Write an enzyme that holds these catalytic residues in place. Structure first.
Site, PDB file in Angstrom:
ATOM      1  N   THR H  30      -4.200  -5.694  -9.134  1.00 34.02           N
ATOM      2  CA  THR H  30      -2.977  -4.920  -8.907  1.00 34.02           C
ATOM      3  C   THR H  30      -1.764  -5.751  -9.318  1.00 34.02           C
ATOM      4  O   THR H  30      -1.866  -6.962  -9.500  1.00 34.02           O
ATOM      5  CB  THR H  30      -2.806  -4.486  -7.431  1.00 34.02           C
ATOM      6  OG1 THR H  30      -2.464  -5.620  -6.623  1.00 34.02           O
ATOM      7  CG2 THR H  30      -4.076  -3.825  -6.880  1.00 34.02           C
ATOM      8  N   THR H  31      -0.615  -5.100  -9.453  1.00 33.29           N
ATOM      9  CA  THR H  31       0.586  -5.770  -9.937  1.00 33.29           C
ATOM     10  C   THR H  31       1.280  -6.490  -8.786  1.00 33.29           C
ATOM     11  O   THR H  31       1.434  -5.932  -7.698  1.00 33.29           O
ATOM     12  CB  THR H  31       1.566  -4.773 -10.584  1.00 33.29           C
ATOM     13  OG1 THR H  31       0.865  -3.952 -11.528  1.00 33.29           O
ATOM     14  CG2 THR H  31       2.702  -5.499 -11.301  1.00 33.29           C
TER      15      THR H  31
END
Lengths: 241, 235, 249, 195, 111, 240, 231, 243, 244
Positions: H30-31
């Site tokens: 995920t970012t």
């Protein structure tokens, strides 16, 4: 073909993992050069900050190992910092045990021995770096000693390292053939720095702004790096003559 | 090669799965749990007639209230038996009581996944551990080199086992007497054994609350074989 | 944690120890070095093949003092040589001088170096050393001597020999010229002649490294007043001393 | 324990060792045999600290029996006594030293000679015509110094020993309950069963 | 010199009846001539119908009771929640105590 | 430390290093043991590719572990020394702590245990050795004969053989050994043992060694002559 | 494939195959469900027998008075990990007089599993666990995978066919989260959720294993006749 | 070839392929981002809502080290936890000997040397995380990002994980549009927006935003989680900009 | 991890052989031949040095024959460096035994120890074996004059006459032809040199390619003398036995 994966001999008596570690040494695409004055030792290295999100003040391949010793590294930064930390530990320990500052050439030898071990012991890999150590030694004077992934080292009148080391090397050789002395015959380190930058410009055929370089200077009892502004003042003096 | 502790793409440990193959090559062992006792029987399988078959020891006392039968690479069982005996005796030293059959079994099974690169490989033997304790009565467990153990009303291991287990599926019920269990073990061993079953090439044992673990004399087993022969000839 | 506790040098079906053969090949590529034994001395010599002209090659010492009466030179991998020199200097103290209060005789120091090299050929997780050494020395009861040590740990005493690149030619050259009546200056002259053949470029005091084991040098002791202490027999010749002998060539 | 004597005559070695075992206030035993046969022609008697005496002696015995089986050969009395000495010399600089003194009487079948070795707990070894440990020598050596001859027979050795034991029973304050006497010669080891 | 032991006073009393048992203790804790507490309980319910007191040096007494309670917990974990019988508890406590034979718990224990 | 799992299971449930250890046993000189009514005999084949051998000093094939027990083997000679040393040490240690010499079965169980341990310890290979262990329990007159192998399994035998061509000599023993009537004398037992080796040996020359063990630590190796008289008498009854 | 010989090797797409294979052993395991309200947390587990003569393998393990778990996969690995949890619960009680927070237990299990995924010679654990507890912040449910990922949930399921149970709980979420002060209703929703994962067989009296922990309820396991009520 | 089968092996072009494969695990995560503001730093991360059954707010990802340092990472979450555990030990041992809390550059090298150590041997595997971390020390605010090779530098802003390209461009705009700097409060709002923007590359699932900060003026130089009203206000400001 | 690069030096082949032992034996078959012959009044050791040079310092050179103590010597065939490791170990065992028992170590006890050390490298540790075969010549007062050999397996055997190294098949056949039990040391000296003369791969047998030793009770009265022959003494015995 497992003689290619670990540091054992190939049938021609070669150590491929060492040869490939030399190849990693140019992965940053940075050139560095070092020269000696009457009183000082100067090292310069290209500085490339290719990303705008980077804090450029933290981007460096020049290290203050001890008060008197500086180190420039050609190779990826993780291996560079591994070497820098170790060199700092060795220099401090040396002073504690023997009661005097570790000489530039002795530190180079020590780091070169450690490197030799990685080429003979299978569980350790070579570090993909070339280490140029500089100081003004209390016995030997201005000093340049350079180590590589083979565990080789030697002292230099001047030296260069990186993808374009040959151009810089031949340029430096040509100058010293002319002058016939082992050093830049200049009083001030400012002028020795200007000499160093000038001959890098000639040899690479490129110009530099103040943010394109990194400079380290060794004098009697200290090594220091220059700010962008000290470098600017250098560049200005070069252009005005 | 590959690690001794490697998982296969199906999520099984290669070495454990392979030791299970060695166990399939072992001589047959059978146990049957009843409310009057647990019986343990084995096929001896001497390799030559000059081998003195009463020197074949595949049923073994762990404590007075716990017996054990093995199948597979039976040399591997000796350190397992040694551990089981030490654990039973140690528990009695610390607690002034008999150790539970399940606790003993669990302690043996803790040994099993202790291999790596500890021992260099899984054990190549499976055990039937039978006994009695006050809390859970008569019990029979099957201890594998996977470290898993299952409790059973009846169970067969070794080369004759899935023929024998099908049999046990049909014959076991919760009212078997000890005598009936003995005959049943004898009959199923007779079924799956290569050679003709007699008192020198099969061995019986039981564990009762009263008399503890006992390996049967050859004379005693000979009588039960005779008695089996006659009940079969009578329908 | 080093998990290579097994040998990296093993026997192949033909009886060969591959890694030792390959170490010997690395030595074969190395710059030529030689030694000659005279009646009153030994000389060891090699070429200082400088890697760049910006390199200060007097800071790279191929001929090394091991004890005051013992010196060494090599052909093969320089870094392997440098660490062996550190270990050899140390073992001369730890396994001899700290016990007997005197420096080891040449043959026993050779023996100790050889043992170190043998162990790199059998111990777990290491490769052999990629060097051959020539070790010259003097001691009271054996006089002057010269030994070669190879990557296997084998060592042999020589009257004169050569190792590295041009060794087959240099050894034939030495067989012609060697006799048991050479005086140290004769052996130096022969060393210089022999070494010229394997050298391409420059051939002078700054490109040749030459040392002798000869007479005691009281002038290099550093102190006076103990009659029995007369100075080291090992001496490295200067650039100038080599050039003087190159006119007499 | 207390008295252990030895005498080497013409063709044999005789060891005499007291029978009492005393735990402080009570004589617990009066038939204790303070000796171990190390090999068919080698006997070792011992005295010193409780527990350590027998532990040391059985340890030495186990080792010599091991050697005998490994080599199918009986070590000489000299070789056995050197082995024992080294064990005591190593023990004296231990965390807890064996506090054990021994006599080794052996008949050397190769030289055809009896030999007597005296070794104290420090690993002090000496070969003797006669010896003792503790206070036993103080009462007996003046008699042995007088009567001893290197050509005595076994029976003359026993008679001289009787005299030594009589002097001990006279002048020594402790009741050591007599001695067990054993003879080591070319035929092995035997116990004189009335003394 | 550091003395690792102390004496916290206290008196305890256990009596076995025909189908019951009592374990009693005073609740005073002292050092020398001072009172540390007038109510510091010293007899404990340890589970499985077992009560315990380790009287003497209170640090050792507390450590022992704490270890025994823990041993009851692990007996349940290891032996299918089997009830720890009083004779088994007693043998177990012998091993807890003898484990420090050469640096003892300075207490007199009653269960 | 070198830790590598050398003995491991194969997909078919075989441990090949143990199985290959048995192949080393098959190649070794033949060994046989036969129990009489009041003795046990151990016979060993000597491969005759070796003259100029000095037989006084060359390691003998039967080894005393204690004064009442002997061990012979087939397989790697060097490996056998390691087991023999361990067994001798254990025999003395048993005497020291139990105050009784080992039973023949105890000693067998020990050696077999050492062999098994070397099949599931990291960094070691199995012993390329099978053994025959014979003797008499202290104060017992019933003869004992056991066999061990590289896997560590062991068992008791009326008579047994190991090493090269032991298939053949086992053939012979199975047809010639009657359990209801064991060789009732030393003579009969020694004769049955020499006969079994003659199926396989060559010259009944110094190819055959024989050791007799009787109760009470009575152990003796027959010489070339005494064996020769057995060899002799055996073939003279043959031509018939 | 060339990258699945050990746990110390990434594949060229950045995967860890030995860990994925360990995950595969959970998938073969018998189904187990976990769910909670604000006052209680419940485990339901379908136990597997070997055959008709055999016992049904236990799936639920008590870790402390306020905490326990259920397993799917290699049972001996669950024993190792639950033993570790018992010790850590115990340590927290003895040293700090403090009941170990369920969230903290999850972190400890993650870290213990992680070490077996990054070094030579180890193997990952081959078991999944659902951990329920009641601590100072109420009822909790955790899911542990041997990759070391630990997740806090209202409800979940693991093992063969766990997907049915899991979808059910996803629809029921707004109902079961509110079953406060009624242990029996929470268990029912648990037995209903696990039923969405049965085929061929159904829930019997030696088949079914239930555990519960909550406000004034020590972690307790029901087997045998004590689950007839819910069958 | 076979150069990529074992960590610490140099390929013929001087590369360590196992490290490059670790980077793939990072790119798959995920970012996560960080923004250096005027007197502090802000950290934010996208948490994918895999299911309704995940308890909201409850699987916290950003981690504190000592009291003044925040760490966030993308890739293999357990590897990141292992790295933070080590960082906590390094911080404790630094403070124990030297008294002063560990400075951020000093802390950066501790993590860097440790991560680099896992590229020296074939008996270990490289870390499958990139880590963004920093805080306030005696010389001001510091933001760092550290990769599986052990490589780290100081940053004005940083991003990693699957939405890294989008976040970078957003971060570059901020650097251009504010040479004087961003307030901590502005940085929180901006961080919420950038995670919302970067969540396009991950649009399949919904997500939960998580933010933290250390600011001399706003948190007294201590690391704190952005919660309640201030969190909502940043979520709102983000929702607006994606609309 | 590291397993990938492990040769596994201590495994059986499918025929039940030890690969590394077999390959070490192959190595040893290219070493200079060494011969031992046992007579009633002493022992001879004779060995040929490998292809030499005129510049080799022979009189200070040792490559085949080594003293273990005053009563025991060895001849080496194989890797010299490996041999010296084992030789120094044997020298120490001999002194340990002398210290412990105050008697010189019996020859076989020494031989067995060295052989057990070699055996260990074939069964555990994952290291390569020693590439060495020894001939042991010695005397003790139990068995008198004795000859043994050991090889990389750690197997040892006793001999009246034996060879190791190159051409042992040819050498052994020649020894077996001419060896007789009542033979004396001076006869054994001649047999040894004649045998080397015939089996050598060199053009002729000269003093500078030999090492030579005798162990004789030709030390005055019940005592034993070892004699490592000097180059001149090897030259004389070549002439005297008429080989040059």
């Amino acid at each position: 073909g497992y003689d290619r994966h670990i540091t054992i001999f190939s049938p021609e008596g070669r150590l491929y993992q060492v040869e490939y570690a030399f190849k990693a040494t140019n992965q940053t695409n940075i050139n560095s050069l070092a020269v000696r004055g009457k009183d000082c030792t100067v090292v310069i290295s290209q500085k490339k900050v290719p990303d705008k999100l980077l804090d450029p003040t933290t981007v460096s391949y020049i290290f203050c190992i001890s008060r008197t010793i500086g180190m420039v590294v050609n190779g990826p930064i993780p291996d560079a910092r591994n070497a820098a930390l170790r060199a700092k530990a060795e220099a401090a320990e040396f002073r504690y045990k023997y009661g005097y500052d570790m000489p530039c050439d002795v530190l180079a030898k020590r780091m070169a021995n450690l490197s030799q071990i990685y080429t003979q012991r299978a569980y350790m890999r070579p570090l993909g770096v070339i280490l140029t150590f500089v100081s003004v030694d209390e016995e030997l004077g201005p000093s340049i000693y350079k180590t590589d992934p083979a565990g080789y080292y030697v002292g230099y009148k001047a030296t260069a390292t990186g993808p374009k080391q040959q151009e810089i090397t031949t340029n430096l050789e040509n100058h010293f053939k002319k002058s016939k002395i082992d050093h830049i015959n200049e009083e001030s380190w400012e002028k020795v720095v200007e000499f160093a930058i000038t001959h890098m410009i000639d040899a690479l055929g490129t110009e530099f702004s103040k943010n394109d370089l990194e400079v380290g200077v060794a004098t009697k009892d200290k090594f220091f790096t220059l700010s962008a502004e000290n470098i600017e003042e250098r560049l200005v003096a070069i252009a005005e003559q | 090669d590959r690690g001794v502790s490697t998982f296969s793409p199906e999520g099984r440990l290669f070495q454990v799965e392979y030791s299970l193959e060695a166990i399939k090559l072992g001589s047959t062992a059978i146990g049957i749990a009843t409310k009057e006792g647990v019986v343990l029987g084995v096929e001896k399988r001497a390799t030559s007639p000059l081998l003195e078959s009463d020197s074949i020891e595949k049923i073994v006392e762990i404590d007075r209230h716990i017996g054990c039968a093995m199948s597979g690479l039976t040399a591997d069982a000796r350190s397992m038996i040694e551990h089981a005996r030490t654990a039973a005796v140690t528990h009695n030293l610390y607690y002034d009581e008999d150790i539970n059959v399940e606790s003993l079994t669990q302690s043996v099974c803790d040994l099993a996944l202790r291999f790596g690169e500890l021992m260099s490989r899984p054990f190549g033997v499976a055990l039937l551990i039978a006994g009695h304790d006050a809390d859970d009565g008569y019990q029979l467990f099957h201890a594998e080199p996977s470290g898993t153990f299952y409790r059973y009303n009846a169970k067969a291991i070794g080369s004759g086992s899935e023929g024998a287990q099908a049999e046990l599926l049909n014959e076991w019920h919760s009212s078997l007497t000890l005598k009936e269990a003995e005959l049943l073990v004898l009959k199923i061993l007779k079924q799956v054994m290569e050679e003709k079953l007699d008192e020198n090439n099969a061995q019986l044992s039981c564990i009762t609350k009263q008399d503890g673990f006992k390996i049967y004399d050859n004379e005693k087993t000979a009588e039960l074989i005779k008695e089996l022969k006659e009940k079969e000839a009578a329908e | 944690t080093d998990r290579y506790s097994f040998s990296l040098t093993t026997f192949s079906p033909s009886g060969k120890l591959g890694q030792i053969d390959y170490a010997l090949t690395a030595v074969k590529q190395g710059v030529t070095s030689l030694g000659i034994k005279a009646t009153n001395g030994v000389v060891i010599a090699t070429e200082k093949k400088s890697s760049s002209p910006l390199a200060m090659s007097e800071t790279l010492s191929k001929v090394s003092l091991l004890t005051p009466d013992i010196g060494a030179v090599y052909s093969g991998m320089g870094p392997d040589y440098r660490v062996l020199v550190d270990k050899s200097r140390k073992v001369a103290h730890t396994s001899y001088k700290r016990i007997y209060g005197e420096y080891p005789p040449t043959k026993l120091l050779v023996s100790e170096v050889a043992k170190i090299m043998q162990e790199a050929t059998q111990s777990g997780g290491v490769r052999p050393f990629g060097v051959s050494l020539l070790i010259a020395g003097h001691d009271e009861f054996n006089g002057f001597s010269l030994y070669q040590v190879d990557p296997s740990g084998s060592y042999f005493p020589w009257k004169a020999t050569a190792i590295g690149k041009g060794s087959v030619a240099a050894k034939t050259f030495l067989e012609k010229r060697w006799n048991d009546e050479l005086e140290l200056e004769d052996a130096i002259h022969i060393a210089l002649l022999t070494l010229k053949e394997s050298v391409e470029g420059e051939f002078n005091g700054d490109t040749i490294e030459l040392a002798i084991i000869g007479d005691e040098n009281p002038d290099l002791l550093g102190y006076t007043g103990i009659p029995t202490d007369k100075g080291p027999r090992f001496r490295k010749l200067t650039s100038q001393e080599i050039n003087d002998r190159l006119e007499a060539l | 324990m207390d008295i252990i004597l030895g005498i080497r005559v013409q063709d044999s070695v005789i060891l005499a060792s007291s029978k009492a075992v005393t735990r402080g206030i009570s004589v617990l035993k009066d038939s204790d045999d303070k000796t171990r046969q190390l090999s068919p022609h080698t006997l070792m008697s011992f005295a010193g600290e409780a527990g350590d005496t027998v532990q040391f002696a059985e340890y030495i015995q186990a080792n010599i029996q091991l050697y005998s089986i490994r080599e199918d050969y009986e070590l000489s009395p000299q070789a056995v006594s050197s082995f024992v000495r080294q064990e005591l010399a190593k023990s004296i600089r231990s965390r807890r030293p064996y506090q054990v003194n021994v006599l080794i009487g052996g008949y050397d079948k190769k030289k055809n000679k009896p030999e007597l070795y005296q070794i104290d707990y420090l690993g002090t070894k000496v070969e003797l015509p006669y010896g003792a440990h503790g206070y036993s020598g103080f009462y007996t050596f003046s008699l042995l110094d007088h009567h001893y001859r290197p050509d005595m027979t076994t029976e003359e050795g026993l008679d001289l020993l009787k005299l030594c034991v009589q002097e001990l029973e006279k002048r020594m304050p402790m009741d050591f309950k007599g001695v067990i006497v054993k003879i080591v010669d070319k035929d092995g080891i035997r116990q004189v069963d009335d003394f | 010199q550091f003395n690792p032991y102390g004496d916290n006073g206290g008196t305890i009393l256990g009596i076995a009846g025909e189908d019951f048992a009592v374990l009693a203790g005073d609740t005073r804790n002292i050092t020398d001539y001072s009172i540390n507490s007038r109510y510091e309980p010293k007899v404990f319910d340890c589970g499985d119908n077992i009560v315990m007191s380790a009287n003497g040096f209170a640090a050792d007494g507390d450590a022992l009771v704490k270890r025994f309670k823990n041993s009851v917990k692990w007996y349940h974990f290891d032996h299918n929640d089997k009830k720890l019988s009083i004779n088994s508890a007693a043998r177990n406590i012998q091993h807890l105590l003898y484990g420090k034979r050469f640096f003892p718990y300075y207490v007199h224990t009653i269960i | 430390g070198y830790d590598r799992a050398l003995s491991i299971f194969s997909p078919d449930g075989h441990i090949f290093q143990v199985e290959y250890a048995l192949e080393a046993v098959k190649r070794g000189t033949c060994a046989v043991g036969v129990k009489g009514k009041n003795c046990v005999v151990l016979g060993c084949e000597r491969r005759s590719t070796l003259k100029l051998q000095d037989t006084r000093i060359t390691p003998s094939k039967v080894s005393k572990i204690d004064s009442h027990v002997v061990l012979s083997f087939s397989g790697l000679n060097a490996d056998s020394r390691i087991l023999i040393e361990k067994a001798r040490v254990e025999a003395q240690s048993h005497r020291l702590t139990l105050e009784d010499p080992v039973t023949v079965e105890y000693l067998t169980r020990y050696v077999a245990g050492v062999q098994q341990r070397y099949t599931q310890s990291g960094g070691v290979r199995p012993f390329g050795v099978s053994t025959l262990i014979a003797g008499f329990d202290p104060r017992d007159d019933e003869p004992k004969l056991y066999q061990t192998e590289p896997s560590g399994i062991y068992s008791s035998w009326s008579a047994q053989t190991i090493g090269r061509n032991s298939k053949t000599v086992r053939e012979f023993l199975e047809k010639n050994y009657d359990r209801k009537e064991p060789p009732a004398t030393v003579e009969e037992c020694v004769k049955l043992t020499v006969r079994s080796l003659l199926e396989v040996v060559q010259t009944g020359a110094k190819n055959i060694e024989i050791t007799v063990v009787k109760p009470d630590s009575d152990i003796v190796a027959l010489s070339s002559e005494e064996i020769n008289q057995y060899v002799t008498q055996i073939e003279q009854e043959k031509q018939e | 494939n060339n990258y699945d010989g050990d746990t110390v090797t990434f594949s060229p797409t950045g995967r860890l195959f030995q860990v994925e294979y360990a995950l595969e052993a959970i998938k073969q395991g018998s189904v187990t469900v976990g769910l909670r309200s604000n006052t209680h947390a419940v485990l339901v587990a379908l136990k597997r027998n070997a055959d008709e003569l055999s016992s049904y393998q236990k799936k639920i393990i008590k870790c402390d008075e306020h905490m326990g778990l259920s397993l799917a996969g290699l049972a001996p690995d669950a024993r190792v990990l639950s033993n570790y949890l018992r010790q850590q619960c115990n340590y927290s009680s003895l040293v700090f007089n403090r009941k170990l927070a369920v969230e903290r237990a999850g972190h400890l299990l993650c870290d213990k599993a992680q070490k077996n995924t990054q070094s030579y010679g180890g193997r990952p654990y081959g078991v999944g666990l659902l951990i329920i507890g009641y601590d100072k912040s109420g009822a909790h449910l955790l899911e542990f995978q041997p990759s070391g990922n630990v997740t806090e949930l209202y409800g979940t399921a693991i093992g063969a066919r766990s997907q049915g149970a899991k979808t059910y709980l996803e629809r029921t979420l707004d109902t079961f989260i509110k079953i406060d002060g009624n242990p029996d209703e929470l268990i029912k929703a648990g037995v209903e959720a696990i039923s969405q994962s049965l085929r061929d067989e159904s829930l019997t009296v030696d088949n079914l294993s239930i555990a519960i922990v909550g406000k004034d309820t020590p972690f307790t396991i029901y087997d045998g006749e004590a689950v007839a009520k819910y069958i | 070839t076979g150069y990529d089968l074992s960590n610490s092996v140099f390929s013929p072009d001087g590369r360590n392929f196992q490290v490059e494969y670790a980077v793939k695990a990072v790119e798959n995560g995920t970012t996560s981002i960080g923004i250096k503001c005027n007197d502090g730093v802000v950290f934010a991360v996208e948490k994918l809502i895999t299911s309704k059954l995940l308890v909201p707010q409850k699987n916290v990802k950003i981690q504190v080290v000592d009291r003044h340092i925040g760490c966030v990472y993308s890739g293999l979450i357990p590897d990141g936890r292992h790295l933070v555990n080590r960082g906590r030990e390094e911080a404790a041992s630094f403070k124990k000997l030297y008294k002063t809390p560990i400075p951020i550059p000093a802390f950066a090298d501790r993590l860097g040397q440790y991560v680099q150590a896992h590229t020296l041997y074939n008996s270990v595997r490289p870390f499958g995380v990139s880590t963004i971390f920093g805080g306030v020390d005696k010389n001001g605010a510091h933001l760092y990002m550290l990769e599986p090779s052990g490589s780290y530098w100081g940053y004005k802003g940083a991003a990693t994980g699957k939405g890294r390209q989008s976040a970078k461009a957003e971060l570059e705009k901020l650097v251009d549009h504010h040479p004087e700097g961003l307030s901590a409060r502005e940085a929180v709002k901006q961080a919420a927006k950038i995670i919302y923007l970067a969540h396009e590359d991950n649009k399949e699932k919904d997500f939960e935003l998580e933010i933290s900060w250390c600011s001399l003026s706003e948190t007294n130089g201590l690391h704190k989680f952005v919660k309640g009203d201030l969190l909502q206000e940043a979520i709102d400001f983000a929702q607006k900009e994606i609309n | 991890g590291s397993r990938r690069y492990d040769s596994r030096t201590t495994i059986f082949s499918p025929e039940g052989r030890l690969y590394q032992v077999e390959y070490a034996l192959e190595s040893i078959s290219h070493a200079g031949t060494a011969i031992g012959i046992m007579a009633s009044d002493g022992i001879v050791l004779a060995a040929e040095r490998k292809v030499t040079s005129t510049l080799l310092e022979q009189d200070t050179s040792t490559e085949k024959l080594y003293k273990l103590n005053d009563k025991i010597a060895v001849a080496v065939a194989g890797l010299t460096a490996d041999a010296e490791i084992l030789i120094n170990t044997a020298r120490i065992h001999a002194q340990n035994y002398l210290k412990t028992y105050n008697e010189d170590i019996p020859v076989e006890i020494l031989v067995r120890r060295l052989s057990d050390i070699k055996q260990g490298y074939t069964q555990h540790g994952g290291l390569r074996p020693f590439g060495v075969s020894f001939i042991y010549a010695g005397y003790d007062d139990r068995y008198g004059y004795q000859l043994y050999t050991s090889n990389p397996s750690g197997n040892y055997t006793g001999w009246k006459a034996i060879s190791v190294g190159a051409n042992t098949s040819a050498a052994q056949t020649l020894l077996q032809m001419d060896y007789k039990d009542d033979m004396k040391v001076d006869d054994a000296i001649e047999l040894a040199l004649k045998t080397l003369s015939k089996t050598t791969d060199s053009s002729a047998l000269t003093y500078d390619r030999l090492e030579f030793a005798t162990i004789r009770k030709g030390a005055n009265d019940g005592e034993v003398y070892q004699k490592i022959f000097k180059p001149q003494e090897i030259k004389d015995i070549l002439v005297k036995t008429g080989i040059t």
